[PDB]
Amino acid sequence: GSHHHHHHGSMQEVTMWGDSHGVAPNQVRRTLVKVALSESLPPGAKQIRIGFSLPKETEEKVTALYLLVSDSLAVRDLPDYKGRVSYDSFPISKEDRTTALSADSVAGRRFFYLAADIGPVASFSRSDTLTARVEEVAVDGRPLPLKELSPASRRLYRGYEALFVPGDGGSRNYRIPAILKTANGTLIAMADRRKYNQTALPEDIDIVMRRSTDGGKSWSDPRIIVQGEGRNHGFGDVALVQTQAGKLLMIFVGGVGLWQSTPDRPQRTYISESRDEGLTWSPPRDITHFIFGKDCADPGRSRWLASFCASGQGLVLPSGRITFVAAIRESGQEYVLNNYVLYSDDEGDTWQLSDCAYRRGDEAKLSLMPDGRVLMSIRNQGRQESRQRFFALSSDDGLTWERAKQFEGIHDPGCNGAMLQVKRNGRDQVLHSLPLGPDGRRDGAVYLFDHVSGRWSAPVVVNSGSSAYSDMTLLADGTIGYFVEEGDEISLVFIRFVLDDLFD
Ligand SMILES: CC(=O)N[C@H]1[C@H]([C@H](O)[C@H](O)CO)O[C@@](O)(C(=O)O)C[C@@H]1O
Ligand SMILES: OC[C@H]1O[C@@H](O)[C@H](O)[C@@H](O)[C@H]1O
Numbered sequence: 001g002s003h004h005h006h007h008h009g010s011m012q013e014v015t016m017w018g019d020s021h022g023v024a025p026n027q028v029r030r031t032l033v034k035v036a037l038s039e040s041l042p043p044g045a046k047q048i049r050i051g052f053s054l055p056k057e058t059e060e061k062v063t064a065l066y067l068l069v070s071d072s073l074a075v076r077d078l079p080d081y082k083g084r085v086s087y088d089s090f091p092i093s094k095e096d097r098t099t100a101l102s103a104d105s106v107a108g109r110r111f112f113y114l115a116a117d118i119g120p121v122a123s124f125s126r127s128d129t130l131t132a133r134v135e136e137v138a139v140d141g142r143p144l145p146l147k148e149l150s151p152a153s154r155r156l157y158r159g160y161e162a163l164f165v166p167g168d169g170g171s172r173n174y175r176i177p178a179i180l181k182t183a184n185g186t187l188i189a190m191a192d193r194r195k196y197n198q199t200a201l202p203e204d205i206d207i208v209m210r211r212s213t214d215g216g217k218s219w220s221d222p223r224i225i226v227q228g229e230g231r232n233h234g235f236g237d238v239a240l241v242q243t244q245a246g247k248l249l250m251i252f253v254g255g256v257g258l259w260q261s262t263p264d265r266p267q268r269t270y271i272s273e274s275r276d277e278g279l280t281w282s283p284p285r286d287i288t289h290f291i292f293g294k295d296c297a298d299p300g301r302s303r304w305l306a307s308f309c310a311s312g313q314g315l316v317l318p319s320g321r322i323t324f325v326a327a328i329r330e331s332g333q334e335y336v337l338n339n340y341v342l343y344s345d346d347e348g349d350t351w352q353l354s355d356c357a358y359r360r361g362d363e364a365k366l367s368l369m370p371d372g373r374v375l376m377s378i379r380n381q382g383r384q385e386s387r388q389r390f391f392a393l394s395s396d397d398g399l400t401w402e403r404a405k406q407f408e409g410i411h412d413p414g415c416n417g418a419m420l421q422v423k424r425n426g427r428d429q430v431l432h433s434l435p436l437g438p439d440g441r442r443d444g445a446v447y448l449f450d451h452v453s454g455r456w457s458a459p460v461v462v463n464s465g466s467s468a469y470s471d472m473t474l475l476a477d478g479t480i481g482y483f484v485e486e487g488d489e490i491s492l493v494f495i496r497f498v499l500d501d502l503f504d
Pocket of ligand 2: 046
């Protein structure tokens, strides 16, 4: 083996991880450091003592400390599992730097969490972070060597909440975030309820929703709004808009996998609408026949094989035209997709396709430029060219398109993300979310593109660690809501900040 293992007895081993998830004011029992024993305390043990450090700046930002003890080693803060992780909580005075528990209280468990209640105050700047470190773990007065696998650094954000966590509602997994703010200020968050594992269609998947009427301060209990009925009969990959008339529209796919779809046995595209801020939804309406396949009235598209609109949000233009970008498979001989805008000029009654917007594209998103042109951002699938994100422009409200290399300048490891058109210090800019990578789904970042100089900012990492799809919306009061896939086993996390918190 990699290490020498002695033969004079069993050797307890201690591992510790500092936490780097975001936090927000007033949150309860937030993990700062996690400690794992490799085996239970031995039967003759009487006490475990844990010594720790915590800088004054962090002490001033917390109201209470705790040692939590669990039989489970969890990725996220223990309250995020809503009781599915059982734990005991042992208070520590916030000024103390050591704590001890009897072996009987530990009751054979191996996992310890130095946790804190967060106070009401914060500056939210890049440097507004919380940290602690475990300095000693001693059993019956004998210290153990500690294996430190990560430092603690929890950034304070104006809002931070995991809205969908593995296990919630009985679903094993969650993926594929979509966020919408309505004109009345309601927030709708939807996701794939990946009930049996984290894999895509053709797995059996439901679509689930939560809604907030207070700007993300609190969220309704999750509701399954489309229920998968078995393998090859699931639904997922939601994108959302609100039409000019005010109805909410969700578009999604269901059925076999994208590469298994054929003209005669398609993976289908459906729409559903809500006229009451997301409280109720119409039965899914199949609109596949407007796009491709054996029921399509355009014979030039009746042999195309598959289509899916990119999850997250579409775009409703000032004219009222409703748009989403579809990525369409035109040939069964190649694993290649071409982008077309799927649009409706009659509030969703009928749907049409633009001319082709991008060859060898993938999930693509739209945003409205200051002058009325439409910018499209296209995922780079298959490490094409210089592994950069691709862009295109339309000046006819999405009907025709031309590649826009001047907008390129950020890496795309091959992942969905989102755009917001913003004004900052009097300058029109585009905010774009993507994982930084490089070449992996790590370090969820945002960048600003300055329209006038044609240059991208350095990235700002919002959520370090494993990070994948992201969606973003602008709230009424000027904050940005950023809804991201955090972790290798994904939770969908809603983070609220203003631009100056990240870029100033
Ligand atoms: C309908 C569908 O399959 N959507 C899936 C897409 C497409 O397969 C790729 O974008 C095609 O290249 O990719 C994911 O798997 C991914 O990369 O995390 C997630 C998503 O659920
Ligand atoms: O070092 C030994 C001593 O240390 C204590 O902390 C421990 O609980 C007892 O076993 C005692 O005998």
